[PDB]
Amino acid sequence: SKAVIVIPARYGSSRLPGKPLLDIVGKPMIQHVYERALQVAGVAEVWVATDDPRVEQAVQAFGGKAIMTRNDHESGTDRLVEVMHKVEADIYINLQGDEPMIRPRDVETLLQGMRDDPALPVATLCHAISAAEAAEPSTVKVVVNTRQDALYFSRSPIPYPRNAEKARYLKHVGIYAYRRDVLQNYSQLPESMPEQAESLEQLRLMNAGINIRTFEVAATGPGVDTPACLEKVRALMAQELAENA
Amino acid sequence: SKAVIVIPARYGSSRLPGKPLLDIVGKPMIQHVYERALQVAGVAEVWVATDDPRVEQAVQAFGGKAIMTRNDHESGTDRLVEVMHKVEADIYINLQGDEPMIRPRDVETLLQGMRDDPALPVATLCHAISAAEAAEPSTVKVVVNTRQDALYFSRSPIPYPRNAEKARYLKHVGIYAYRRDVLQNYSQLPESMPEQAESLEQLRLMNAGINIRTFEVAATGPGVDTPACLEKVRALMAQEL
Ligand SMILES: Nc1ccn([C@@H]2O[C@H](COP(=O)(O)O)[C@@H](O)[C@H]2O)c(=O)n1
């Protein structure tokens, strides 16, 4: 079973132009993600999928593998489908190019899950959050059954807190592992009403009856989207270097 | 493929004690439900499951069939499980004893669905509602996939209206059809965290991975929970004549 990690990294961003190129303790953000991806056991290759030459150059400059993709791509899953045709693997892992604090062990958990169950099409991550955090529409919640399969994903707080003290919330961590056949049949799936309403691409899979197992990990480090969280990551990353001396 | 309709009708109610015996244009509420149930094609028997001798006698008075069940059941579902042991069938339909405006056609849609797919364990109903109505925690919303299987049931407005004009909402109508094997295993299913938090018993099935197909019907009539709804139903069933 061959597994590869693909890191989508488009330059264009409204509140952070050239987001993957921002410096974090001396290296572009995209490099930190790539370096951590390389530490994931069981992965054959790591690639960066981009639609901008500057990103491709920055990646090659540190010796990373870059593959140009179409800029007309609406989603990071469509971009991964294009990569799938050129890069062969049985399992593709999609990592966010803007989460430099990703833990290699979490990707291994995800990979081990896919290998322990040959029938599993998609796998993703989640971690426990408080009810107060779950109230945010910018945070995606997920509810799972006993096998840890996702029942639904939503920006609405689910489960509804009728008996508030009994409610436990899970935040969805946007890292995915897809079997090859899922990506091959992907472009034929129609957009679902819940997907368009919620603006959550993963609901397109659920509409088609494709199971998504969700593994729970510890609270993940802060992503980068706000210049405030950027400074926190910078200090958190720097605090990490001195800790491992 | 033998199907039976079971109507849970406990005497008690915090807002309307003796609810099944309340008069609605000449007949107790339970009789209206029982008569409409008898109009459902494809069913072999209709039973009223109750805990009180007063309800049992009232049903026998109009010629219906009734079975005494334990008074310690927490829900009509548990009451149905007790009945399944006494009344043998392949498919059991659970009708609410407080919804006298039930349309026989809607129960036939549900039954047809179960017969069209022998692999389907549970089926239920739903109908379109507005965004305004979906915002209410007392209204249970359901989201389904292309095969109409339910993804989740919630009091929260699902789907979240990020793009409001794209959102379409469905209200769950508490009528169920269960295959016998689901009921034989029901007592072994543990309660789920989502069930306890939302206070929705059907989430106990989803937690165990049991599929629930949801068929869509037109807007249904109100049930009788409060004395206000009781007066509204009386008014509606009167003009319906
Ligand atoms: N313990 C319980 C609770 C409810 N039920 C039944 O469930 C249906 C709807 O519930 P409520 O009227 O209690 O709200 C009624 O037909 C009622 O008799 C039951 O049979 N046993």
Q: 């899953």: which residue's tokens?
A: A77
- Torsions phi, psi for A109 (to 5 deg): -60, -45
In the Cβ-directed half-sphere of B90, how many Cα atoms lie within 13 Å?
A: 12
Q: How many interchain CB pairs under 8 A, A with B?
A: 108
| Helix %, strand %, coil % of chain B (to 5) | 35, 25, 40
Residues 6 or more apart from A225 whose CB is under 8 A from it? Answer: A15, A16, A98
Closest CA to A140 of A148, A149, A150: A150
CA distance A56 to chain B (A): 33
Mutation pick from B136, B158, B168, B211 vs chain A, by most beta carbons of A within 10 Å, is: B158
Span between the terminal Cα atoms of chain B, in Å: 35
The nearest alpha carbon in chain A to B195 belongs to A159
Q: CB-CB: which of B154, B155, B166 is closest to A196?
A: B166
3-class DSSP string for chain A: CCEEEEEECCCCCCCCCCHHHCEECCEEHHHHHHHHHCCCCCCCEEEEEECCHHHHHHHHHCCCEEEECCCCCCCHHHHHHHHHHHCCCCEEEECCCCCCCCCHHHHHHHHHHHHHCCCCCEEEEEEEECHHHHCCCCCCEEEECCCCEEEEEECCCCCCCCCHHHCCEEEEEEEEEEEHHHHHHHHHCCCCHHHHHHCCCCHHHHHCCCCEEEEECCCCCCCCCCHHHHHHHHHHHHHHHHHCC
Per-window interface: A 176-215 vs B, CB < 8 A: 192-194, 196-199, 206-209
Burial of B116 (0-12, 13-18, 19+ CB in 10 A): exposed
Distance from residue B72's CA to the centre of ligand 1 (Å): 12
Pairing of strands A91-94, A23-24: unpaired
User: What technique solved it?
Assistant: X-ray
- Asked if B198's CB is within 8 angstroms of A145's CB, the reply is no
Our CA-based measurement puts residue B209 at a distance from the nearest CA of chain A, in whole angstroms, of 7
Among candidate residues A41, A40, A39, A30, the one with its CA nearest the CA of residue A7: A30
Q: For ligand 1, atom 14, name the residue with the nearest CA.
A: B225
Radius of gyration of chain A (CA): 18
Residue A182: phi and psi, rounded to 5, are -65, -45
Q: Name chain A contacts of B139, Cβ cutoff 8 Å.
A: none
| Cα–Cα dist B73/A236, whole Å | 55
**Contacts with B156 from chain A: Cβ below 8 Å:** 154, 156-160
B119–chain A Cβ distance below 8 A for any pair: no
**CB of B126 within 8 Å of any CB in chain A?**
no
Q: Which residues pair with B127 in a beta bridge?
A: B171
User: Please, which residues have CB within 8 angstroms of residue B185's CB and are 6 or more apart in sequence?
Assistant: none
What is the C-alpha separation between B186 and B113, in angstroms, rounded?
A: 21
> For residue B78, how far is its CA from the centre of ligand 1 (angstroms)?
10
B9 alpha carbon – ligand 1 mean position (Å): 6
Range of the domain at A175: 1-245
Number of domains, chain B: 1
DSSP label of B188: G
Query: Which residue, by CA, sits nearest to atom 13 of ligand 1?
Result: B13
Sign of dihedral through CA atoms A61, A64, A69, A73? Answer: negative
> Which resolution in angstroms does this entry have?
2.1
Cβ atoms within 10 Å, residue B155: 21
Q: Which residues of B touch A208 (CB under 8 A)?
A: 145-146
Residues of chain A neighbouring B208 (CB-CB closer than 8 A) = 145-146
- For ligand 1, atom 17, name the residue with the nearest CA: B9
Which residues approach ligand 1 with their CB closer than 6 A? B 8-10, 13, 73-76, 79, 96-98, 225
Question: Cβ of B160 and A154 within 8 Å?
Answer: yes
Strands B45-50 and B66-68: parallel
- A-chain CB neighbours of B167 within 8 Å are 193, 197
Q: Are A60 and A27 in contact (CB under 8 A)?
A: no
CA A206, distance to chain mean position in Å, is: 17
- Comparing C-alpha atoms, which of B57, B23, B15 is closest to residue B234? B23
Q: From CA A222, how far away is CA B201, in angstroms rounded? A: 37
**DSSP-derived pairing of the beta strands B27-28 and A212-216:** unpaired
Q: Are A123 and A33 in contact (CB under 8 A)?
A: no
DSSP secondary-structure letter at B10? -
What's the gap in Å between B125 CA and the centre of ligand 1? 18
Q: Select the residue of A161, A163, A199 nearest B163 (Cβ to Cβ).
A: A199
Q: How far apart are CA B92 and CA B178, in angstroms?
A: 5
The domain that holds A228 is classified in CATH as 3.90.550.10
Per DSSP, the three-state class of B2 is: coil
Smallest Cα distance from A34 to chain B, Å: 33
Q: Are B114 and B177 in contact (CB under 8 A)?
A: yes
Hey, is B206 helix, strand or coil?
helix
Contact partners, residue B21, CB within 8 Å, separation at least 6: B11, B28, B29, B30, B54, B55, B58
Measured in angstroms, how far is the CA atom of residue B98 from the centroid of ligand 1? 8
Distance CA A15, CA B13 (A): 57
Sequence-distant (6+) residues with CB within 8 A of A134 are A141, A157, A169, A171
Task: Determine contact: A152 vs chain B, CB below 8 A.
Answer: yes
Write down the residue that tokens 């890292």 correspond to: A175
How far is the centre of ligand 1, averaged over its atoms, from the C-alpha of B7 (Å)? 9
From residue A20, give the alpha-carbon distance in Å to each of A9, A37, B47.
Answer: 7, 15, 67
Give the DSSP H or E segment for B52.
none
Q: Nearest CA to B214 among B123, B105, B114, B104?
A: B123
Strand ranges (E), chain B: 3-8, 23-24, 27-28, 45-50, 66-68, 91-94, 122-129, 141-144, 150-154, 169-179, 212-216
Closest Cα to atom 18, ligand 1: which residue? B9
